[PDB]
Amino acid sequence: TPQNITDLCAEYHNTQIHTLNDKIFSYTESLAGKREMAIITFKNGATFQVEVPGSQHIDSQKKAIERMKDTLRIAYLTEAKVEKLCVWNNKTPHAIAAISMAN
Amino acid sequence: TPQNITDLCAEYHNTQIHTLNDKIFSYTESLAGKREMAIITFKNGATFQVEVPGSQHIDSQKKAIERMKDTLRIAYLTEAKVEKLCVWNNKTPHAIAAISMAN
Amino acid sequence: TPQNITDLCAEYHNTQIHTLNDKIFSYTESLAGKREMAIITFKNGATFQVEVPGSQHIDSQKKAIERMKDTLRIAYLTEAKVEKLCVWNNKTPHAIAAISMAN
Amino acid sequence: TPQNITDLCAEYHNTQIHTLNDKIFSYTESLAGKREMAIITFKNGATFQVEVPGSQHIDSQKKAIERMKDTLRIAYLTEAKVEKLCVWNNKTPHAIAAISMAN
Amino acid sequence: TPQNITDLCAEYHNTQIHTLNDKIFSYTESLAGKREMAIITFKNGATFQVEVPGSQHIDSQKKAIERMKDTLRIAYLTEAKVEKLCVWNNKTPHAIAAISMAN
Numbered sequence: 186t187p188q189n190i191t192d193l194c195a196e197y198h199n200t201q202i203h204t205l206n207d208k209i210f211s212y213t214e215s216l217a218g219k220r221e222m223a224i225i226t227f228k229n230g231a232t233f234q235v236e237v238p239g240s241q242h243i244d245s246q247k248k249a250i251e252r253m254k255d256t257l258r259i260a261y262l263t264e265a266k267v268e269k270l271c272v273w274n275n276k277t278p279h280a281i282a283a284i285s286m287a288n
Numbered sequence: 289t290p291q292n293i294t295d296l297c298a299e300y301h302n303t304q305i306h307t308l309n310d311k312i313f314s315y316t317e318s319l320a321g322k323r324e325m326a327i328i329t330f331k332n333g334a335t336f337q338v339e340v341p342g343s344q345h346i347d348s349q350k351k352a353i354e355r356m357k358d359t360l361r362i363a364y365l366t367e368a369k370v371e372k373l374c375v376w377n378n379k380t381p382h383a384i385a386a387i388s389m390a391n
Numbered sequence: 392t393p394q395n396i397t398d399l400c401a402e403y404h405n406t407q408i409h410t411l412n413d414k415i416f417s418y419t420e421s422l423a424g425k426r427e428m429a430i431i432t433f434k435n436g437a438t439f440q441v442e443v444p445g446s447q448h449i450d451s452q453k454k455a456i457e458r459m460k461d462t463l464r465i466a467y468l469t470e471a472k473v474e475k476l477c478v479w480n481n482k483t484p485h486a487i488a489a490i491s492m493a494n
Numbered sequence: 495t496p497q498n499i500t501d502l503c504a505e506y507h508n509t510q511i512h513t514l515n516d517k518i519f520s521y522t523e524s525l526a527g528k529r530e531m532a533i534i535t536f537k538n539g540a541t542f543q544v545e546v547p548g549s550q551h552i553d554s555q556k557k558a559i560e561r562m563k564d565t566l567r568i569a570y571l572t573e574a575k576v577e578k579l580c581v582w583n584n585k586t587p588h589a590i591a592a593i594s595m596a597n
Numbered sequence: 598t599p600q601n602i603t604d605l606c607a608e609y610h611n612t613q614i615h616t617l618n619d620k621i622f623s624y625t626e627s628l629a630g631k632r633e634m635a636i637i638t639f640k641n642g643a644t645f646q647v648e649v650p651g652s653q654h655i656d657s658q659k660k661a662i663e664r665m666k667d668t669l670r671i672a673y674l675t676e677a678k679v680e681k682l683c684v685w686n687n688k689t690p691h692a693i694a695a696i697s698m699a700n
């Protein structure tokens with residue numbers, strides 16, 4: 186079991202850490218069919234998504250995907266500082282796997 | 289996959305972007321049967337709905353519809369600036385497909 | 392589809408608009424069996440309920456009843472101004488069908 | 495249908511109203527198996543639980559028990575004044591049936 | 598039934614109470630498959646997890662695991678002082694069973 190987000194990252198292929206140390210600049214959310222997803226951006230210009238749930242996801246991930254969209258929304262609205270994101274770099278925008286918050 | 293709301297908009301027929309750059313002026317919600325919906329307005333008079341769930345919606349949209357009504361309520365109560373809305377313009381009021389917030 | 396709460400209320404028999412333009416004075420909620428409900432009051436003495444789910448309700452109302460109790464709780468805790476309530480005026484207390492918030 | 499918590503409490507056997515007129519002093523929550531419960535205290539020493547769901551509860555109460563734990567968590571974090579609790583006074587700690595907030 | 602966290606802790610093997618009397622320093626959560634977990638730290642370096650749901654958990658714990666992650670996130674975001682954690686000491690990071698907040 187990992188102790189931090191950087192060690193969690195390293196347990197997967199096609200992932201990387203972004204160190205943002207900043208609040209979320211924009212939050213976008215969609216209910217349009219086949220694009221039920223969220224997108225966030227930071228002022229350094231980087232854009233990330235929470236993927237549309239799909240065949241790449243196992244059943245145990247379904248509640249965690251919804252939790253992640255809830256976390257991004259409330260982090261955006263509280264201007265909470267995002268320390269790091271672990272993302273899959275085989276998607277565009279890069280796909281969020283995990284988030285750490287600290288200030 | 290789109291990187292922003294405007295590009296997401298462009299993947300659908302009968303949609304348009306409204307640029308509001310303003311907080312929500314009023315938030316209405318209903319539990320009345322066949323009208324289980326939300327309506328929002330802006331100061332300029334613009335009025336939008338989240339549609340009642342129906343046969344137009346695929347299974348993957350059901351939770352995203354509930355999420356959008358959550359998002360509009362907390363945007364209203366935080367006075368969060370709404371940048372853009374993507375809407376279906378073949379409905380009256382215009383029906384929300386996606387929202388972007390930035391301030 | 393209606394554009395505001397007054398027009399929505401007119402789509403139903405035995406309903407009434409109350410114009411409160413005030414924040415909720417008191418919020419009460421119960422988990423007691425057969426009384427799983429919420430009650431709000433205004434400082435003028437007006438009292439309203441969200442009804443216990445029952446055979447008067449269709450299945451699409453079940454999520455909207457739970458949402459309405461979530462809305463009343465967060466409205467109460469943010470001191471948000473309630474503009475109007477649409478209610479079934481033949482229930483005692485009057486039973487909430489819809490709410491609009493604006494300030 | 496009752497109009498206030500005191501009248502609601504009088505529709506049940508083995509219940510009592512406590513008038514606290516104070517914010518929650520501590521909030522405790524557990525995910526330990528057979529002890530999925532919450533406990534709150536007030537600074538006067540009064541201690542209350544939300545019961546572990548069990549065979550004493552009917553299926554309509556499932557959702558309401560989860561809502562009550564959500565209500566006590568946000569009441570505690572907002573320092574919301576609790577007016578009254580309706581409790582089952584034969585359980586130890588006394589078990590919450592309903593809550594009223596007013597200030 | 599226990600009346601406080603310490604007494605609850607003592608109903609389980611391999612548990613211990615940690616007295617933190619401090620806010621949460623970092624909050625991490627993950628949707629990556631098989632690592633659907635949360636991790637919190639405190640500024641003295643203490644690190645704790647909410648375990649990935651698994652065959653160690655009974656059905657009644659599913660909801661309470663999800664609630665505990667919700668509680669940690671909103672405690673983090675409100676800088677709520679955590680009084681005590683009850684953890685299992687046979688996992689690394691130590692695994693959260695219960696939390697108390699008081700200030």
Ligand SMILES: CC(=O)N[C@H]1[C@H](O[C@@H]2[C@H](O[C@]3(C(=O)O)C[C@H](O)[C@@H](NC(C)=O)[C@H]([C@H](O)[C@H](O)CO)O3)[C@@H](O)[C@H](O[C@H]3[C@H](O)[C@@H](O)[C@@H](O)O[C@@H]3CO)O[C@@H]2CO)O[C@H](CO)[C@H](O)[C@@H]1O[C@@H]1O[C@H](CO)[C@H](O)[C@H](O)[C@H]1O[C@@H]1O[C@@H](C)[C@@H](O)[C@@H](O)[C@@H]1O
Pocket residue numbers: 217218219220299300301302339343344345346376378379383
């Ligand atoms: C435009 C439309 O009718 N939308 C309905 C949709 O139809 C499908 C195809 O349209 C798109 C669409 O634009 O919506 C094409 C998009 O590129 C696509 N986007 C992405 C990223 O996937 C989008 C999505 O797949 C769906 O929205 C996901 O739910 O679908 C459309 O071209 C196709 O048309 C067929 C036609 O049906 C045939 O008769 C024949 O002429 O061949 C055409 C070409 O293939 O039909 C597709 C359906 O299989 O399907 C949706 C259900 O999957 C749904 O019916 C959708 O309707 C709209 O729904 C939104 C909310 O989801 C709003 O309510 C909006 O008002 C709806 O649009 C109206 O009502 C519909 C019920 C239908 O009567 C529409 O004509 C009407 O505009």
Ligand SMILES: CC(=O)N[C@H]1[C@H](O[C@@H]2[C@H](O[C@]3(C(=O)O)C[C@H](O)[C@@H](NC(C)=O)[C@H]([C@H](O)[C@H](O)CO)O3)[C@@H](O)[C@H](O[C@H]3[C@H](O)[C@@H](O)[C@H](O)O[C@@H]3CO)O[C@@H]2CO)O[C@H](CO)[C@H](O)[C@@H]1O[C@@H]1O[C@H](CO)[C@H](O)[C@H](O)[C@H]1O[C@@H]1O[C@@H](C)[C@@H](O)[C@@H](O)[C@@H]1O
Pocket residue numbers: 196197198199236240241242243273275276280629630631632
């Ligand atoms: C890299 C990859 O394709 N991942 C997909 C996964 O594949 C499994 C194994 O991969 C890992 C992983 O890195 O993700 C190995 C990690 O160590 C695991 N981590 C932990 C902590 O457990 C990780 C997780 O267990 C899973 O992600 C949880 O579901 O799995 C991978 O090594 C193995 O690969 C086989 C391959 O199938 C086979 O043909 C080849 O011959 O040999 C190799 C080596 O055995 O397959 C494993 C199958 O489970 O499988 C998942 C479904 O079970 C996903 O599909 C996952 O894909 C990625 O999902 C995430 C979301 O979770 C992102 O969307 C990401 O973009 C997905 O990856 C891309 O899309 C998928 C559909 C593939 O086409 C993939 O190649 C793309 O890169």
Ligand SMILES: CC(=O)N[C@H]1[C@H](O[C@@H]2[C@H](O[C@]3(C(=O)O)C[C@H](O)[C@@H](NC(C)=O)[C@H]([C@H](O)[C@H](O)CO)O3)[C@@H](O)[C@H](O[C@H]3[C@H](O)[C@@H](O)[C@H](O)O[C@@H]3CO)O[C@@H]2CO)O[C@H](CO)[C@H](O)[C@@H]1O[C@@H]1O[C@H](CO)[C@H](O)[C@H](O)[C@H]1O[C@@H]1O[C@@H](C)[C@@H](O)[C@@H](O)[C@@H]1O
Pocket residue numbers: 320321322323402403404405442446447448449479481482486
């Ligand atoms: C007035 C009424 O009977 N309401 C109940 C409803 O009845 C349907 C029709 O009623 C409306 C309504 O005004 O509520 C008509 C509206 O046009 C509809 N609006 C929209 C936007 O669609 C509305 C909705 O469809 C439903 O509310 C959502 O489910 O329904 C009513 O006029 C119609 O009457 C028939 C009659 O039965 C028939 O014999 C006669 O020949 O023709 C007329 C017209 O064709 O019946 C409809 C249903 O059969 O049905 C609902 C369930 O689908 C509920 O039972 C509803 O009752 C009220 O429910 C709300 C909560 O949603 C409150 O609890 C309210 O107190 C309920 O009303 C009281 O208690 C109920 C159980 C009845 O005793 C009612 O008479 C009481 O006032």
Ligand SMILES: CC(=O)N[C@H]1[C@H](O[C@@H]2[C@H](O[C@]3(C(=O)O)C[C@H](O)[C@@H](NC(C)=O)[C@H]([C@H](O)[C@H](O)CO)O3)[C@@H](O)[C@H](O[C@H]3[C@H](O)[C@@H](O)[C@H](O)O[C@@H]3CO)O[C@@H]2CO)O[C@H](CO)[C@H](O)[C@@H]1O[C@@H]1O[C@H](CO)[C@H](O)[C@H](O)[C@H]1O[C@@H]1O[C@@H](C)[C@@H](O)[C@@H](O)[C@@H]1O
Pocket residue numbers: 423424425426505506507508545549550551552582584585589
């Ligand atoms: C008092 C009691 O036994 N409560 C259990 C309940 O029993 C039903 C009737 O009780 C009330 C009640 O006060 O709880 C009576 C109220 O008028 C009802 N109010 C409303 C608004 O409807 C109320 C509710 O319907 C239910 O709570 C909803 O579930 O029920 C009780 O009077 C009745 O008694 C019969 C009796 O059994 C029979 O022998 C005699 O001849 O006639 C009388 C008159 O009718 O039995 C009813 C059920 O058959 O039933 C519930 C399950 O439906 C629970 O078991 C409930 O127990 C309490 O549950 C709450 C949580 O909801 C708390 O945990 C509380 O501590 C429980 O009470 C303890 O445990 C139970 C098993 C009893 O031993 C009781 O003595 C303990 O205090």
Ligand SMILES: CC(=O)N[C@H]1[C@H](O[C@@H]2[C@H](O[C@]3(C(=O)O)C[C@H](O)[C@@H](NC(C)=O)[C@H]([C@H](O)[C@H](O)CO)O3)[C@@H](O)[C@H](O[C@H]3[C@H](O)[C@@H](O)[C@H](O)O[C@@H]3CO)O[C@@H]2CO)O[C@H](CO)[C@H](O)[C@@H]1O[C@@H]1O[C@H](CO)[C@H](O)[C@H](O)[C@H]1O[C@@H]1O[C@@H](C)[C@@H](O)[C@@H](O)[C@@H]1O
Pocket residue numbers: 526527528529608609610611648652653654655685687688692
């Ligand atoms: C200690 C333990 O093994 N815990 C696992 C549990 O075992 C049950 C009994 O354990 C307690 C406990 O301390 O957890 C005893 C308490 O008195 C109970 N408290 C209350 C209020 O009820 C408590 C709870 O009932 C359960 O935790 C609720 O799920 O259970 C344990 O003593 C007993 O042991 C048997 C033994 O199996 C048997 O061969 C022998 O004949 O007698 C002894 C004594 O009776 O078994 C009980 C189960 O039948 O069972 C749980 C599933 O019901 C879990 O497996 C639990 O493991 C721990 O789970 C938590 C999360 O809930 C953490 O992940 C923790 O790290 C887990 O412990 C380790 O992993 C598990 C899977 C085992 O390998 C265990 O040995 C490890 O310590």
Ligand SMILES: [Ca+2]
Pocket residue numbers: 264
């Ligand atoms: Ca600011």
Ligand SMILES: [Ca+2]
Pocket residue numbers: 367
């Ligand atoms: Ca203002």
Ligand SMILES: [Ca+2]
Pocket residue numbers: 470
């Ligand atoms: Ca005030």
Ligand SMILES: [Ca+2]
Pocket residue numbers: 573
């Ligand atoms: Ca204070």
Ligand SMILES: [Ca+2]
Pocket residue numbers: 676
């Ligand atoms: Ca601070």
